[PDB]
Design a protein around this ligand. Sequence first.
Ligand SMILES: CC(C)CN(C[C@@H](O)[C@H](Cc1ccccc1)NC(=O)O[C@H]1CO[C@H]2OCC[C@H]21)S(=O)(=O)c1ccc(N)cc1
Ligand SMILES: [Cl-]
Ligand SMILES: [Cl-]
Ligand code: NA
Lengths: 99, 99
Amino acid sequence: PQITLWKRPLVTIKIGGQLKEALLDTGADDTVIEEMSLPGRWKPKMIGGIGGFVKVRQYDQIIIEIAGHKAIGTVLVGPTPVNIIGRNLLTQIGATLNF
Amino acid sequence: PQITLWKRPLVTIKIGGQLKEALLDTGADDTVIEEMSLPGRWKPKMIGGIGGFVKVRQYDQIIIEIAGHKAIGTVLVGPTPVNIIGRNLLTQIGATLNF
Ligand SMILES: CC(C)CN(C[C@@H](O)[C@H](Cc1ccccc1)NC(=O)O[C@H]1CO[C@H]2OCC[C@H]21)S(=O)(=O)c1ccc(N)cc1
Ligand SMILES: [Cl-]
Ligand SMILES: [Cl-]
Ligand code: NA
């Protein structure tokens, strides 16, 4: 689709067997999701933004379906106020910013 | 342009006659820039980022060029890790996300 930016660009994702709403975020390097369980190995990580840093768990090689488009990559899990799809997965679905 | 997301979508902005680097950020409701002098009055605003809430200074009706496109709108000034162009100004320059 072509998504305007009058409102937040929220889409439905499927991750870990769960449907969630997430923000398509060109300003986020990395995908970050609210607390949930995911399978496999993980390691701790700190990510920072406005407000400072938060501690997250880094899970690699996780499959996500974003608005119907499958992708695989790293997913960070932790206390984010909103689920965010960052560039690491936006590239995989062919997302571009156009003007 | 059509900007892919393999690297951060950084552009040049011009504000107050000065060139700066900023990130095109679909996950930001609002444009937030690092400490600088802007004309006129300001109003208080709280914004909530990934690490919590921060106070910023809200300046309205500021002339700003974004990758060569003219915009006039609200600019927040405060402790951000990078200058961010949010949806309030991305809409002014006609940006959409496409996949
Ligand atoms: C500040 C950016 C350089 C980085 N961020 C992405 C950014 O899009 C966040 C994404 C975001 C969105 C909502 C809540 C928290 C974080 N937006 C944000 O902080 O925007 C603020 C300015 O406008 C307001 O509207 C939204 C919050 C305010 S971030 O959330 O801190 C972040 C940092 C690292 C990763 N991997 C993922 C996300
Ligand atoms: Cl990845
Ligand atoms: Cl590509
Ligand atoms: Na894994």
